[PDB]
Design a binder for this molecule. Structure first.
Ligand SMILES: Nc1nc2c(ncn2[C@@H]2O[C@H](COP(=O)(O)OP(=O)(O)O)[C@@H](O)[C@H]2O)c(=O)[nH]1
Ligand SMILES: [Mg+2]
Length: 165
């Protein structure tokens, strides 16, 4: 090594988009468990393996002094809620103002399992992401679609930058 890695990640997005479920699916493989109380757990930690190294992810759930340690940000909307998607512009603008200069970013279109109630097309999300030069994927905390993908991707981008300088 013998460097150790702890990446502080932040979930941000409108109330109700699934931030807490994303966090608890990734860290406990749970969704609407009757055994887990989520109140008021501020973060969860999961360790992943990258390049043979054990990377600690400290993932926080819901102005500068708010983005203080954050190295990566998941910008979350709900594919069944157009307004939550529309507010992503605003979240991006806030992050640009108050977060670290080079914070790594990713947009998540969550609840992609609810296809009969979809209000935001995958195409709309992809185009918005492409416009800001931000990575994108559709997720489901319920079905465990792209939740690991999202975190592994962001972590890789943080590590790649950190391993340069
Ligand atoms: N079907 C489905 N429902 C979800 C998903 N993620 C969250 N939810 C539901 O959406 C609601 C809001 O989720 P929550 O995690 O509390 O949102 P938060 O306000 O962003 O913390 C809850 O009823 C969740 O069960 C998902 O991927 N699929
Ligand atoms: Mg929550």
């Amino acid at each position: 090594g013998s460097h150790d890695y702890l990446f502080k990640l932040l979930l941000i997005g409108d109330s109700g988009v699934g931030k807490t479920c994303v966090l608890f699916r990734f860290s406990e493989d749970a969704f609407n468990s009757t055994f887990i109380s989520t109140i008021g757990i501020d973060f969860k930690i999961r360790t992943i393996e990258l390049d043979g190294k054990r990377i600690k992810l400290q993932i926080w759930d819901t102005t500068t002094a708010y983005y203080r340690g954050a190295m990566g940000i998941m910008l979350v909307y709900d594919i069944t809620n157009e307004k939550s998607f529309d507010n992503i512009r605003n979240w991006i603008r806030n992050i640009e103002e108050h977060a670290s200069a080079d914070v790594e970013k990713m947009i998540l279109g969550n609840k992609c399992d609810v296809n009969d109630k979809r209000q935001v097309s995958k195409e709309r999300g992809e185009k918005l992401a492409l416009d800001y030069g931000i990575k994108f994927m559709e997720t489901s905390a319920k079905a465990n679609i792209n939740v690991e993908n999202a975190f592994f991707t962001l972590a890789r981008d943080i590590k790649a930058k950190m391993d340069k300088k």
